[PDB]
Design a binder for this molecule. Structure first.
Ligand SMILES: C[C@@H]1CC[C@H](C(=O)Nc2ccccc2)CN1c1cc(-c2ccc3c(N)[nH]nc3c2)nc(N)n1
Length: 274
């Protein structure tokens, strides 16, 4: 393995993402001219805020993932004050930005991007890993406009954001592969409608709607997409299409909404123009 890298090995540029506990900055490695999204964490802050388990979890999950639809962790290093994680740079930023920019996706684009998300979850779940906070904000787009999923601090390894929270969190404080499938249902809805299905004035009211399954479809909603969303946004987590009790990804990928999809080499296909 190559030597440990250090801050002086890079020219840092613009901020790519910001949170309460870390910041992601674009960096060019001087020796190679390669660009990375370097996530920078202050050790003292992470300790004082008791976030060590989330940082450790992200580092451990993002190392293990070897699939084109995920941001990869390439290296780590530290100085006196900070931890640095070298991540895949997804040049086109968040899926959320595209939804805001174009309003809502047509059916060809909805189908393609939903298929990539499904294929990514199939990989992740096949490794016994659940994301637990999947959303358009952490589904990134690379230079070629394929997805790259990131932000793995909340991931669970098998022995979140209000709008996408599954009912089992609100009623049981629990989560399973099926929680990611609920998030998928919300995301498909948001691609088609242009807005998340559970919306309200404040977090409390959103939670109220989720536990009552209080949402509805706009008239312009692709009917096959509507049927799919209805088979994902189900209160009983064991009855969501894609979950183990529903016999997994086979029946999900076979849904009529995906009729024209070739599943085998999505990463090799040219995405539809947005
Ligand atoms: C800072 C940001 C928001 C907060 C989140 C958090 O703190 N979550 C959390 C907090 C507490 C506990 C658990 C989880 C961590 N976030 C990110 C951002 C990116 C990222 C962004 C842009 C990129 C680009 N253009 N190419 N690559 C990129 C990679 N990658 C990871 N892994 N995490």
């Amino acid at each position: 393995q190559p030597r440990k890298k250090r801050p002086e090995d890079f020219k840092f540029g613009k901020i790519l993402g910001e949170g309460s506990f870390s910041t992601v900055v674009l960096a060019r490695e001087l020796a190679t001219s390669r660009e990375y999204a370097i996530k920078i964490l202050e050790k003292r802050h992470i300790i004082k805020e008791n976030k060590v388990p989330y940082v450790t979890r992200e580092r451990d999950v993002m190392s293990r993932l070897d699939h084109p639809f995920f941001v990869k962790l390439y290296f780590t290093f530290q100085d006196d004050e900070k931890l640095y994680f070298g991540l895949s740079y997804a040049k086109n930023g968040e899926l959320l930005k595209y939804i805001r920019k174009i309003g809502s996706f047509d059916e060809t684009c909805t189908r393609f991007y939903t298929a990539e998300i499904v294929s990514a979850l199939e990989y992740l779940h096949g490794k016994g890993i659940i994301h637990r906070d999947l959303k358009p904000e952490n589904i990134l787009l690379n230079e070629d406009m394929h997805i790259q999923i990131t932000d793995f601090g909340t991931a669970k390894v098998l022995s979140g954001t209000a709008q996408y929270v599954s009912p089992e969190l609100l009623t049981e404080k629990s989560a399973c592969k099926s929680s990611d499938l609920w998030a998928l249902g919300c995301i498909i809805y948001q691609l088609v409608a242009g807005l998340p299905p559970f919306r309200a004035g404040n977090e409390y009211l959103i939670f109220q709607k989720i536990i009552k399954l209080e949402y509805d479809f706009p008239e312009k909603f692709f009917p096959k997409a509507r049927d799919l969303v209805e088979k994902l946004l189900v209160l009983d987590a064991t009855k969501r299409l894609g979950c183990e009790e529903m016999e997994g990804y086979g029946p999900l990928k076979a849904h009529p909404f995906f009729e024209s999809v070739t599943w085998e080499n999505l990463h090799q296909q040219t995405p539809p123009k947005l």
